[PDB]
């Protein structure tokens, strides 16, 4: 009496698993939450046209679990479910080429996601998670629907939510290949001598305090645990880039002094991001809109700088 069909189920779109599907039970009763080309089919009973089709399932058992972990580098049970929810909307976005880079046309408050994708395309970074790396390669070719949905899944954000660019970068750089990133900082207090700390990974490339890379190299005033105020300065930096951040203040961007930057108009309840990169002239990329300019002076919150190796001249 039981009548079945043959399908493939997967969690990483590479390892296919052959499955005999009872046509009298829904895909949910047999596999749990199931998707077919993104479309949720958990409540749907098999159709004869589903023969040989590939179905996305969540890692219910042990084989799928390790397979999903090698692909996404996360154990969050709800990750793939949240990835599919964001992907429903991100497939409808438009990714036009702007100034040589893939941008995101305005929709669903994706201006902070637009600044992330733009900044990434100017940095020499790789992703350790194979799902992020494959989706990023497709993103540089104007096919960024998967990459944006993954970014929302790793950041625990949903479509339509306002977002923070630097926070989003922090989540994705955890899955970046920053193993060789090294940063050495000195804390010079006139009472409590000198102090050296070495930072690695994401902490070696990101900094919160000033937008100026030179400020970090000459001296930043930092509180001292003893009670005074000491000066922090960069001793050694080994990475392909650095990211300086600060609360949105008004700042003058000069050509030939930085790689790219993000600016923020508004307050801490609602604002708008636009991206500024440096090619032949200063480019301003506001979603699908491009604007060239000689000078720029506005409310900057993130600034990126190219880097290979820097050693201080101070002692």
């Amino acid at each position: 009496e039981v009548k079945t069909i043959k399908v493939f189920t997967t969690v990483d779109n590479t390892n296919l698993h052959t499955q005999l599907v009872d046509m009298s039970m829904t895909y949910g009763q047999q596999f749990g939450p199931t998707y077919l080309d993104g479309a949720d089919v958990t409540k749907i009973k098999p159709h004869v046209n589903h023969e040989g089709k590939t179905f996305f399932v969540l890692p219910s058992d042990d084989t799928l679990r390790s397979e999903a972990f090698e692909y996404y580098h996360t154990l969050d049970e709800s990750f793939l479910g949240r990835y599919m929810s964001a992907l429903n909307h991100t497939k409808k976005w438009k990714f036009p080429q702007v100034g040589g880079l893939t941008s995101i046309k305005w929709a669903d408050n994706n201006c902070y996601l637009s600044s992330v994708l733009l900044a990434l395309q100017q940095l020499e970074v790789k992703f350790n998670a194979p799902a992020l790396q494959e989706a990023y390669y497709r993103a540089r070719a104007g096919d960024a629907a998967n990459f944006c949905a993954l970014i929302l899944a790793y950041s625990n954000k949903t479509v339509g939510e306002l977002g923070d660019v630097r926070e989003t970068m922090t989540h994705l750089l955890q899955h970046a290949n920053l193993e060789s990133a090294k940063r050495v900082l000195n804390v010079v207090c006139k009472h409590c001598g000198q102090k050296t700390t070495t930072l690695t990974g994401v902490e070696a490339v990101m900094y919160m305090g000033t937008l100026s890379y030179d400020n970090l190299k000459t001296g930043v005033s930092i509180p001292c645990v003893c009670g005074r105020d000491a000066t922090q300065y960069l001793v050694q930096q080994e990475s392909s880039f650095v990211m300086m951040s600060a609360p949105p203040a008004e700042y003058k961007l000069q050509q030939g002094t930085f790689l790219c930057a993000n600016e923020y108009t508004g307050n801490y309840q609602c604002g708008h991001y636009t991206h500024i990169t440096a090619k032949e002239t200063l480019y301003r990329i506001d979603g699908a809109h491009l604007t060239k300019m000689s000078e720029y002076k506005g409310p900057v919150t993130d600034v990126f700088y190219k880097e290979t190796s820097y050693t201080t001249t101070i002692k």
């Binding site: 201006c111 902070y112 306002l162 660019v165 930072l199 902490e203 919160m208 923020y264 604002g271 991001y273």
Partner: protein, 77 residues
């Protein structure tokens, strides 16, 4: 075994918070939230530049009596 640490806000002022090094960072954030008026999702804490992940104990970050945690506001763009 409670001690006291400082949490500095974005205006440059540090309030004292009574904590145990076994309590999680998420526990501390609910105290900073009640004092400064911001709700937890809209800010994040750092100590000597290193961010604090919510569900880890405070003792793993080397917090000393009267250390200064920093409060950073998350933009909404």
């Amino acid at each position: 075994e409670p001690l006291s640490i400082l949490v500095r806000n974005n205006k440059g002022r540090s309030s004292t918070y009574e904590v145990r090094l076994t309590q999680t960072v998420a526990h501390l954030k609910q105290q900073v939230s009640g004092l400064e008026g911001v709700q937890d999702d809209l800010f994040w804490l750092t100590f000597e530049g290193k961010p604090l992940e919510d569900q880890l104990p405070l003792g793993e970050y080397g917090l000393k009596p009267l250390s200064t945690v920093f409060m950073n506001l998350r933009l909404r763009g």
